[PDB]
Structure 1
């Protein structure tokens, strides 16, 4: 996250770190005792399932914590419509190898209804342990960063992404995506934040409105963060989890 601030421990207790071969590569969001949501782009087919971990309950990634917990995965389920970089369907359900126990620091985020609308301009928060500027990693001990971002409709966002765009890039905010952020530079999610949550306030609670999707930009003007709408997959998530792990 560039242009944000440190969260405080426990503030975003659904935020998870996903690592591949021991290196943090993406965020994710805890949604039940055994399931996490992240982005499909974080799970390329050539990667090996057994090489992923998910760290829950963390604030400073590099610090010892008795509250953090690490898990492997027993299933990785990208939405089947996700085809290539920038595609719709950029969401993945991850089933932990074993269920975890919720705590002060590890709690699921509520998922929105299929037809939940989060209005343009709502101030949501994106969080992660990604880069704090282009090609600049978050410095150890890596406290979780957060950035408050107003929701930007996909229509406005597509017109911003057209400005000074590379002709050969599609930069397309799909029908299952929304944006959030600023037209000015300097405030954005960056490499390593993708897959993580856009948490929005509703009636005193927090919902997972979005999952950070595609992008190279880290703070460029006219490149607000692009997110997959969890609402676009509410039915698929409920169907999959109910069939695979009924409560």
Structure 2
């Protein structure tokens, strides 16, 4: 997370770490006793389900946390729309091998209904253990990082992306997406934050508005990060609850 700050331990109980062969590759967000939302690209077909693990209640990634359950994965369902796009449908459900027990440090976030809209400029928080700058690692013991970022309409976000757009590197924000960040940059999610929650408070209550997805760089001017809309998939996700 570029330009953020360290969360207190237990401040984002729905945040999870995703490891392939014991290496953190993606963040994730817990949504029930046994399910996790993340991003489709964090799970290329070449990888083996058996080698995916998940860490929860994990505040400092490189530290033995007392209450920090770890689980293998029973299932991985990327959205049907994905394997034929690389343009849309960038989300996956992870079924844990066994349902886990909630504690002060492990707790799911609520999903927004399909017909849910969040006002622009609403300040939301993204959270991850990603690079703190273009290819610069978060420093051990890797405290979960957080960052308030305002939501940006997809029309305005496409205006931004067109600024100094490289014809060969097209970035378009699709209907299943939303942007959050600052136009002058410096604040944004980076590599390793994919799958992470964009949590938006609505009346003392946290909703999973987006899943960290992609962005031009991270801290780039006129290139705020793009997140996969949770609401655009509520229908689908509800099809396994």
| Shorter-chain TM-score range | over 0.9
- Measure how far apart 1:84 and its partner are: 6.2
**How far apart, in 1, do the equivalents of 2:218 and 2:150 lie?**
17
Deviations 1:64-99 (A, max 9, x none): 111111111010000010136752111100001111
- Measure how far apart 1:149 and its partner are: 0.3
- Measure how far apart 1:216 and its partner are: 4.7
Native 8 Å contact 1:85 1:214 kept in 2: no
Most deviating of 167-176 and 186-195: 167-176
Native 8 Å contact 1:15 1:56 kept in 2: yes
Native 8 Å contact 1:177 1:229 kept in 2: yes
Per the normalisation by structure 2, the TM-score is 0.97
Deviations 1:22-65 (A, max 9, x none): 11001100000100000111111111111111100011000111
Q: How has the CA–CA distance of structure 1 residues 137 and 8 changed in structure 2, closer, same or farther, with 3 Å as cutoff?
A: same
* Structure 2 residues not aligned, in runs of 5+: none
Partner of 2:34: 34
Native 8 Å contact 2:27 2:196 kept in 1: yes
Q: Which runs of 4+ in 1 moved over 2 A?
A: 83-86
- Measure how far apart 1:2 and its partner are: 0.6
Per the normalisation by structure 1, the TM-score is 0.95
Deviations 1:186-240 (A, max 9, x none): 1010000011000000111100000011235111111111001100010100113
Partner of 2:147: 147
* Structure 1 residues not aligned, in runs of 5+: 242-247
RMSD over aligned Cα, in angstroms?
1.1
**How far apart, in 2, do the equivalents of 1:124 and 1:104 lie?**
22
**How far apart, in 2, do the equivalents of 1:85 and 1:184 lie?**
30
Partner of 2:2: 2
Native 8 Å contact 1:124 1:149 kept in 2: yes
Native 8 Å contact 1:41 1:85 kept in 2: no
Q: How has the CA–CA distance of structure 1 residues 138 and 194 changed in structure 2, closer, same or farther, with 3 Å as cutoff?
A: same
The aligned runs of 1:1-247 (5 Å cut-off) are 1-83=1-83, 86-241=86-241
**How far apart, in 1, do the equivalents of 2:21 and 2:215 lie?**
23
**How far apart, in 2, do the equivalents of 1:236 and 1:147 lie?**
28
**How far apart, in 1, do the equivalents of 2:216 and 2:18 lie?**
19
Deviations 1:144-195 (A, max 9, x none): 0001000001111111111112211221111010000010021010000011
